């Protein structure tokens, strides 16, 4: 059973709590799109673990590379190069858009965002950073100072020079222009404000292509592009955080490629390590060079570690080779339909959005008022689990809670439907 | 050969530079206390990789656990518990001093320091942090704002409320009291200054038991204790960073245990993951509880990941079981002697210090002036490599450069001597 | 002549420049609504000096009190009370709205704003301050960090926690709601943003009733009130800066009295000292009491100085007694008409706004595009002077430049017209 | 009587409290070295009011100029020059040391310090400011962020980049070097610390020649000079705050002239306005020019106001003409003797220090322990008043309280003795 008192005792005894509620179960294992409790119940994993596992749990491929490097070239002195590392950096420069040339191999996405931030500060000679008001970039310093969806209160001043502008939100729009959501004018309008608040030290703007934690918010057609122009105009970099959007999830190797808009620095992590702690940043050779004349430093213990580097390559590989970017479009599409189908059955389903295998369903009391469904969201969520389907709901202020659906790119068709089905059920029971 | 032009081309083409110089070689593998280039030359690893590898490269044990979890329970949703995790947290609460009860399982040491910092801020309601002027805590935000040994310039204001006090340095003392280094009075004296600079928002003091990057600086007899009293007095926590000192390196499971002084939060990483990216913090159940009433949040992708958690346990295990804490005292002692022996041969050897398997040798032009040996340090360093022994020199302002010697706790006797020998040679050639 | 080479030499030799252009003349004297150059040309003063002189230059009354105290009770030890001081504080508590009880007697408006700011910080336990994006509060620290109309660049980070929201601007509105300027929704909308940027440390909002330097921007009907509710809602004070609006200029003793909305702290200076350096703040007895349990400190050299205190009382007096608050409505009205009249003659006159004897005329290229008239504004300005009428134009980004008309409350009818006339002329010549 | 209930009622009713205790009396007038209560008791003014009145109360000269300008050229538009202004700026450039060329005419000393600070920030492109730990510069922003003697707690973060170093204190020295107070090494030692804390943004160091509020602390022989070299070395300005030291008080027109060391910017206020609110800064023509290419702005209401400008000139004049700089040495000397004489009588008199007519007497329990005399200081103080002599005691942490004696430069011999005498009495009664 999931009841091991000792387990729970200790769990109670020795764990720091750091957010949310602990799932009442004891996950004994995980394969493909499933995890299994201490009872052996298979739980359909619709979040790809913590939104990482892009090949699912325990993909034989990773298992091979892993074992392999673990016993061959594990960890090294940060100033010693090895193959995996050069291979990965290169691949990366290779599969990323033009203008992305050099990479830095780290461990976490907050980390990756910090590396990025420091780098723009170093190169602009500036310190002011701007993000979305519903952004999420990490638990650490800069990353954290740029994070607005949550975690700002009770932990001291943020980093000097932190600003945020509202994010273009077609579902709950608030900027009218001639009777329409002129989200482009919003942009303008925000920036003029920011402009007015600047000490004249704009260094960058950081952004998630689709705000995951912020509620699956997709930057509307032309935004990014407009955005980019905003930075360029003010001598700021545009850092694109693809911790969740990167690596095929949205149906392209990289979300920014959808807009055909390439940032100054791009950052990767979750989907890159596919469950393992590997992160990275990528930038143009020009920016790198300058960072370099300027002494850029971001030296870590695991910066450039063979084993981790090994793993992302393999991932990368697999991805390509299995055409998972596309598999993600297919299934992503299969899922949507299903979602809309439930949306047809159920009124509380106020919205179906996202891209690829990254969708969110917004819960409302009534479509007409788009009034957030309080408690409802979680009942559904709660019921899913009973039903043996793992899910994730996000609740910000101002909006119905959002289920964040992000199943493995290796997910199967059947797997899809199943989720879909348990969901309708859970919606059924939940009302 | 180490000459693969393509390798170097790409390396040149696609790598972000983030500090130092890249070793001109191509590390093909690593076992026990050695790494091996593309030619097959075995290089004696005196830094334990990036000061992590406490069981050396590719310890069969880790290789087993690793493979094992990789294929069984890899990565999970941050809000789902598993065995490795509870086991590790517990062990940890167990092998740490009394008063350390609950743990948080993360990935990096900067990370771990950030988690810690936020936590004191959250619990004190304050934001001012104080470290040593030659401190090193990480590349990220808070960690970085607390880091004084290096990296402060050209990247914007630091975090609000950052201060530093000089570190008790017996080798290059600057505080006289009745014709002696009254480092205790220094303490007092600094603090009164800090006190005077505070907005009245002292939240914590963060410190490395022995300043590694700062030049292997050991907090003198009674310091820590005195220090602790300084915090307690001002309602501040004392966070102890044992990224390098922790886990047996200094000859105790934990350096703070040497002083018999237990901090408010302790942080682990390098030596904990033994090469792999695993980190942690540990705190009292009281502090945890409060952090918790207060909403402490530090949610990550890899917070509480089975595979990594798995690995540290094994490490931990091995350590105990192989009595490596002690092996570290033994060999650590074997090494020192040797060091002093060279010190007997060579005048440029101004100082031999450290603890356990963490020693540093300070290079001077003359013992009498303790004038840093410029270029010398690196020649030696350079020559070691030729000799096929990996080493690390640190050069701060004000002091002869320091070799930081930190070989695996699994290092052999012979291995020791060998290093020792190549070193004398390298010193010989270097003069 | 205005040509004294020596004068100009020295002027060139020894003056720090601190903004704008120096009037090419040598003001020998000033009486009533006029200043006179070294040639004896009388210059009609439409700005009340630097927008202070509310009784004009050298009002016999002030001259009496001044002389008087100068020779009786000049300056004292900040901790010694005298009559003028208690009298003034009282009057003030008396002529200000209910809820304004205790006063602090200082010297400048920046000063006064600083005293205010510290006081809210002290009492809320918070540090975040919010102003208008086109605000002006002073050259000093906090005042300066809250100032957005200008002076933010090249002088370092601003004070931690500084934000701004756009100001309700009916002339160049940018917030649509159902095809109308819903400036109320703007409010809401801004605040939600701010809310999202807060570290949870909102202490206050500071605001000019009518943005003087920002272009004579009058807070639209219901704004203030709405605003106040915004603060109250978030536990913030509302500080009202009446450096220019206070003391009868807008046609009420205090602008806030127009809205019938009373702030947490009110600040006075320019119009209070009527040319002399006297400033003040006023707050409720409750806020004062608390500031006091909390150790509020704002001790100066001239805090509570008899002579200055003497002067404001007299002013105050005179004002009442001469019913200048009303005289300001009358003439203020006389002026407007005239303005609109010119507005009838001249298209470049895009807008006539303000209150009382505080009006501004916005210069545009064409009414239809409201495109700022570049150079034009200054020609007019330039021509006025030729014509022997002193004027002031303000030019922010985004809007036609604004003449800021603020003649003495003691101005005469004829005086009015004259200005009016020289203005039409100057407009005539300027096109 | 001093008992006017109404007076006290209102006083209670409507005064903001801003530090200290209100003298229980009602000052009806003030002439020469005296103030007089509502009973007519003459109180010997040993603090020159709030340490300003350098010609005493109501000097006929000021009374003349004052009346004069009040009725001729009172206040003007900040961008209009007049005689007094150019005259004063010039005089000033004239009586100040070489290298001080251009002046800015403001109203307060905090103001003056702010103007200064912004100016160094503007010209260095930096933002970090460094002062003494027992400094006092003003109640406002920057001034306040640089103030360490007091007022730092409970009012939010200070300005970004604020540091302090201990002040050279011969009376309670804490820096030993070979058994002596090597205050020079202290300097060095502090700076190395600061250096280590800098983000690399040192813009200036600000300092009082003699720390008035900090306890009459005189920068020891060679300090200033050493100091200056410290700045020059790091590209920082040295701003000298002579609010109290300036204008003849220490026995030179300017304290810095004593050291023969000229700062980058010098600031004046208290002693400059001799009771009236006039302040200023003075800088080299080079710094001014640059500030100017860079857009330096510090525009106020009273910047460059004829009346105030008029007053300081007159002061200045008088000073010269009456050879008060010297009168201050004479009497200053007369006072000291007297002080030491009491010091001979009384053990609680631990120290007699200062310069010119700026001395302080430190109260101790015993000379041997230099243990601050708690309560004692104030009894004396309290008794003085009874005796009808106004005095001021300062009590910081770590030191016996200090009477700050600063009588008018116009003080008489007899006046001196009298003070002296009431003091011995008060000491007598107080024990
Ligand atoms: C006490 C301490 N805490 C946290 C960390 C950071 O851990 P992470 O890097 O994994 O986040 C380090 C690591 N610093 C290194 C990489 C470094 C790098 C640059 C300067 C000094 C030391 P080094 O091993 O050479 O000392 C450390 O010493
Ligand atoms: C865009 C983005 N960038 C960086 C990161 C941080 O990566 P690391 O955690 O590994 O450093 C995250 C991860 N955030 C999680 C854990 C989170 C947690 C809390 C609030 C929102 C999202 P979630 O997966 O639930 O979205 C992320 O979304
Ligand atoms: C060196 C210095 N610079 C600026 C100023 C400020 O001038 P303004 O007050 O006019 O702006 C002062 C004045 N401080 C007094 C009021 C004070 C008050 C509180 C603590 C210490 C000293 P004090 O006269 O008692 O010393 C000062 O000493
Ligand atoms: C609302 C407000 N509050 C405080 C102050 C500052 O008072 P002090 O200057 O005396 O401290 C001013 C004065 N600003 C002037 C000098 C200015 C200067 C520069 C930009 C805008 C306005 P202006 O008169 O031209 O508007 C002010 O308008
Ligand atoms: K590494
Ligand atoms: K996890
Ligand atoms: K006073
Ligand atoms: K003026
Ligand atoms: Na690319
Ligand atoms: Na323990
Ligand atoms: Na009132
Ligand atoms: Na001079």
* Domains recognised in chain B with CATH numbers: 27-58+323-431 (3.90.1150.10), 59-322 (3.40.640.10)
| Residue C298, CA distances (Å) to C74, C301, D19, D140 in order | 21, 10, 7, 9
For residue B183, what is the DSSP state?
A: H
Tell me which chain C residues have a C-beta less than 8 angstroms from the C-beta of A129. none
Q: Kindly report the backbone phi and psi dihedral angles of residue A319, in degrees, each rounded to the nearest multiple of 5, phi listed first.
A: -55, -50
Instruction: For residue B105, give every residue at least 6 positions away whose Cβ sits within 8 Å of its Cβ, in sequence order, or none.
Output: B85, B88, B89, B278, B279, B280, B303, B304, B305, B308, B309, B312
CB contact (8 A) between residue B275 and residue A307 = yes
Are C120 and C239 in contact, with CB atoms under 8 Å apart? Answer: yes
Class of residue D13 by CB neighbours under 10 A (exposed 0-12, middle 13-18, buried 19+): middle
Q: Which ligand is nearest to the CA of D90?
A: 12
Could you tell me which residues come within 8 angstroms of residue B345 by beta carbon, excluding any fewer than 6 positions away? B424, B427
End-to-end CA distance of chain B: 30
For residue B361, what is the enclosing H or E element? Answer: strand B358-363
End-to-end CA distance of chain D: 30
> Which residue of chain D has the CA closest to B178?
D179
Among B48, B131, B243, which is best to mutate for testing ligand 1, by the most ligand atoms less than 8 A from CB? B243
Q: Cβ-count burial of C146 within 10 angstroms (0-12 exposed, 13-18 middle, 19+ buried)?
A: buried
Measured CA to CA, the distance from residue D47 to residue D120 in angstroms comes to 32
Q: Identify the active-site residue in D114, D121, D218, D244.
A: D244
> What's the gap in Å between B73 CA and the centre of ligand 6?
11
Per CB-CB distance under 8 Å, the chain C contacts of D30 are: 72-76
- Interface residue of B185, B187, B193 to substitute, partner D, most D CBs within 10 Å: B193
Taking an 8 Å cut-off on Cβ atoms, the answer to whether D101 and C13 are in contact is: yes
Query: Which structure tokens are listed for B192?
Result: 């009164």
SS3 D84: helix
Q: For tokens 């950030």, what's the residue?
A: B114
Give the torsion sign (CA, A80, B405, B269, A137): negative
Phi-psi region of C48 (alpha: psi -120 to 50; beta: other; left: phi over 0): left
CB–CB of D33/D292 below 8 Å? no
CA gyration radius, chain C? 22
The answer, yes or no, to whether any atom of ligand 3 lies below 6 A from the CB of D243, is yes
Contact (CB, 8 A) for A365 and A183:
no
Structure tokens at A411: 């997910």
CA nearest to C279, candidates C143, C158, C123, C149: C143
The size of the C-D interface in CB pairs under 8 A is: 400
What is the phi/psi pair of residue C241, to 5°? -85, 95
CB-CB neighbours of B24 under 10 Å = 12
D301 dihedral zone (left: phi>0; alpha: psi -120 to 50; beta): alpha
A400 DSSP assignment: -
Q: Rounded to whole angstroms, how far apart are CA atoms C126 and A156?
A: 11
d(CA B59, CA B49): 13
Chain D hits for C298, CB-CB cut-off 8 Å, are 18-19, 139
Note if D241 is an active site residue.
yes
Task: Answer for the pair A135, A165: CB distance below 8 angstroms, yes or no.
Answer: no
* Dihedrals phi, psi of C65, to nearest 5 degrees: -60, -45
Pairing type for strands C29-31 and C34-36 reads antiparallel
- Report the C-alpha gap between A339 and B172 in whole angstroms: 69
Burial profile B401-417: b = 16 or more Cβ within 10 angstroms, e = fewer: bbbbbbbbbbbeeebbe
Range 18-47 of A in CB contact (< 8 A) with B: 18-23, 25-30, 35, 45, 47
Which residue among the candidates B102, B121, B126, B270 is catalytic per the annotation? B270
- Say how many Å lie between the CA of residue C244 and the centre of ligand 4: 8
Interface touch B77/A139, C-beta < 8 Å:
no
Chain A CB within 8 Å of residue C71 CB: no
Q: How far apart, in whole angstroms, are the C-alpha atoms of residue A187 and residue D395?
A: 55
Of the residues A37, A102, A128, A136, which is catalytic?
Answer: A136
Tell me the three state secondary structure of residue C112: helix
Shortest-distance Cα residue to atom 3 of ligand 3: D137
- Residue B34: which residues within 8 A CB-CB, separation 6 or more? B42, B43, B44, B45, B57
On chain B, the residues whose CB falls within 8 A of the CB of D166 are: 193
Residue closest to B256 by CA, chosen among B277, B244, B243, B242: B242
- In A188-236, the DSSP E strands lie at 202-207, 210-211, 217-218
Method: X-ray
| Terminal-residue alpha carbon distance, chain C | 30
Return the number of other C-beta atoms located less than 10 Å from residue C115's C-beta: 29
Resolution, Å (one decimal) = 2.6
From chain D, pick out residues whose CB is under 8 angstroms from the CB of B163: 197
From the list A366, A337, A371, A330, the residue with the least C-alpha distance to A352 is A337
Cα separation of D113 and D137, whole Å?
A: 7
Please list the residues that pair with C109 across neighbouring strands: none
Two structure tokens written together for B163: 């201060």
Buried b (16+ CB within 10 A) or exposed e, C35-70: bbbbeeebbbbbbbbbbbbbbbbbbebbbebbbbbb
Alpha carbons A321 and B270: distance in angstroms, whole number: 35
Spacing, Cα A140 to ligand 5 middle (Å): 21
Ligand 2, atom nearest to A110 Cα: 11
Of how many residues is chain C composed?
A: 431
User: Is C272 at the interface with chain D, CB within 8 A?
Assistant: no
Nearest CA to ligand 3 atom 14: C300
Question: Can you state the percent helix, strand and coil of chain D, rounding each to 5?
Answer: 40, 20, 40
Q: Which element (helix H / strand E) includes B195?
A: helix B183-197
A198 close contact with C: CB closer than 8 A: yes
Identify the residue whose tokens are 């509060």: C137
Q: Please choose from B138, B245, B275 the residue to mutate so as to test ligand 1's pocket, defined by most ligand atoms within 8 A of CB.
A: B138
Cβ pair C193:A158 closer than 8 A = no
A404 belongs to the catalytic site: yes
Task: Give the dihedral sign, CA C322/C324/C325/C327.
Answer: positive
Q: Compute the distance from residue D418 Cα to the ligand 5 centre, in Å.
A: 78
Which spans in C131-269 are helix H? 141-145, 183-197, 223-233, 255-259
Q: Which of A270, A314, A353, A355 is catalytic?
A: A270
Closest CA to B119 of B250, B277, B293: B293
């Amino acid at each position: 059973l999931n009841d091991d008192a000792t387990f729970w005792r200790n769990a109670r005894h020795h764990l720091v709590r750091y957010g949310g509620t602990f799932e009442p179960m004891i996950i004994e294992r995980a394969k493909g799109s499933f995890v299994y409790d201490a009872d052996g119940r298979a739980i359909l994993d619709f979040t790809s673990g913590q939104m990482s596992a892009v090949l699912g749990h325990c993909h034989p491929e990773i298992v091979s590379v892993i074992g392999e490097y673990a016993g061959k070239l594990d960890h090294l002195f940060s100033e010693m190069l090895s193959r995996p590392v050069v291979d990965l950096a290169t691949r990366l420069a290779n599969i990323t858009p033009p203008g992305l040339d050099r990479a830095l191999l780290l461990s976490t996405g907050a980390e990756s965002n910090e590396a990025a931030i420091r780098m723009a500060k170093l190169v602009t000679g500036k310190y002011e950073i701007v993000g979305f008001a519903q952004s999420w970039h990490g638990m650490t310093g800069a990353a954290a100072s740029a994070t607005y969806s949550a975690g700002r209160k009770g932990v001291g001043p943020a980093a000097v020079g932190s600003f945020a502008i509202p994010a273009p939100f077609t579902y709950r729009p608030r900027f009218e222009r001639n009777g329409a959501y002129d989200y482009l004018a919003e942009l303008d309008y925000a920036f003029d404000l920011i402009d007015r608040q600047s000490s004249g030290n704009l260094a960058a703007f950081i952004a998630e292509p689709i705000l995951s934690s912020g509620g699956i918010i997709e930057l509307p057609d032309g935004y990014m592009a407009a955005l980019k122009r905003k930075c360029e105009a003010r001598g700021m970099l545009l850092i694109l955080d693809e911790a969740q959007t990167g690596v095929g999830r949205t149906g392209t190797m990289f979300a920014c490629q959808r807009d055909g808009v390439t940032p100054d620095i791009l950052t990767l992590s979750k989907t890159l390590g596919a469950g393992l702690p590997l992160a990275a940043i990528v930038t143009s050779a020009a920016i790198e060079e300058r960072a370099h004349e300027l002494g850029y430093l971001f030296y870590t213990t695991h910066v450039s570690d063979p084993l981790p580097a090994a793993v992302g390559l393999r991932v990368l590989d697999v991805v390509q080779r299995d055409g998972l970017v596309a598999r993600a479009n297919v299934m992503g599409d299969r899922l949507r339909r299903g979602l809309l189908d439930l949306m047809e059955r159920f009124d509380c389903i106020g919205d179906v959005r996202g891209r690829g295998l990254l969708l969110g369903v917004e819960i409302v009391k009534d479509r007409r008022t788009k009034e957030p469904a309080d408690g409802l969201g979680a009942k559904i969520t709660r019921e899913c689990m009973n039903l043996g389907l793992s899910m994730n709901i996000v609740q910000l202020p101002g909006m119905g809670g959002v289920f964040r659906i992000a199943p493995p790119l290796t997910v199967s068709e059947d797997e899809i439907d199943l989720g879909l089905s348990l969901l309708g059920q859970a919606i059924e029971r939940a009302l």
